[PDB]
Amino acid sequence: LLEHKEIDGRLKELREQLKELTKQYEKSENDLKALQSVGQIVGEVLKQLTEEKFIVKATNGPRYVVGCRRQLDKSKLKPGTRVALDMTTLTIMRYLPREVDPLVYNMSHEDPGNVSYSEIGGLSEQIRELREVIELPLTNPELFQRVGIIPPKGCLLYGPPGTGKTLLARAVASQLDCNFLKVVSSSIVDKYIGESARLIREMFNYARDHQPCIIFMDEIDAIGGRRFSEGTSADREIQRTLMELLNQMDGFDTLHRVKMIMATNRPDTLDPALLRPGRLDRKIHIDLPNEQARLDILKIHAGPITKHGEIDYEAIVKLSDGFNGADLRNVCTEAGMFAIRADHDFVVQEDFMKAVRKVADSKK
């Protein structure tokens, strides 16, 4: 232990602390291999002239006939496949995922927030039905196949607003842990004549590209609102968009593993063709919560709020009739709001009662 106090007095800093310069050398080597690269053109394959010669159109540029790299999946290079071109020899370097519309990108990368199944309350039969019609083809397709039926294309959830259709669909998506396309039908209509149907096309193209995917198109009555021949420009483009949606959902090109959810408050005005089966195979009635459903919603949304002593739900249920969902959540939230009006770190029963009172007055 003469010169072995801890480690030679010096090797402690030289072995790893002063070996961080090797990590910096690793960084330098990454800079090296990034430096030897040259970048590549991008483009879309237009045709397969022969086994080797491909017609490729560079983006916002000229088109060429080009070859492909020696080790590549030529069986994957379908027409329209976005590809990369060597900037000098102009040969197929690597295929790329299809370009996604910025609107579709934004509508796709909104985090569902991993909402669980407990946080719904009092939808048991309907949530079981939706679980069946969407989940089951995505968990055991062999069950459906051996039964002797085609897995369902999708379903509709109709009910008054604030009744949890968005939340229920979000819960299905989170439980599936799949790609989710949250959409509101009022947000796809465009002043430009052919852009709404085009956006529908891009939506379903992304869906087919990113299987398994869930197309949740809220407020569908803003698109599938029945076809009439009055002839006004806006509603006529609405008819065109509805036709495009019908084609993309039960048209010539069949859908495999996309399972699309549609919610609305006015089920009756939907177009019969959209209302016909094959496209929307089930119509789910997410109706206003019942008394037991109301107490379930209350208790499930009373979790995070800290209660002190006594908090009962039947009183709020009996004296909070006609509410729905988000209103009960509002009751809990503004009860929490009340809690700091008198500066508590907790809640009391009268707090809840006056909270539901104010929420009911706001409801009137």
Partner: protein, 69 residues
Amino acid sequence: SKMNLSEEVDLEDYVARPDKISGADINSICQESGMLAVRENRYIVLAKDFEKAYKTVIKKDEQEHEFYK
């Protein structure tokens, strides 16, 4: 045809019922019968879940004020 056996279900009687239903509705009815069979955990449908599916598909609930009629 690809469906499992119906166990002596009056398919001909279901056909004979006068109802304005398109082939999409027939495909629905059959599919919904399969779904009900899955839910009840019986692989061979019969008149019970088939009948529930048939009633479910063609609801056509009038909900119409009788002064129209």
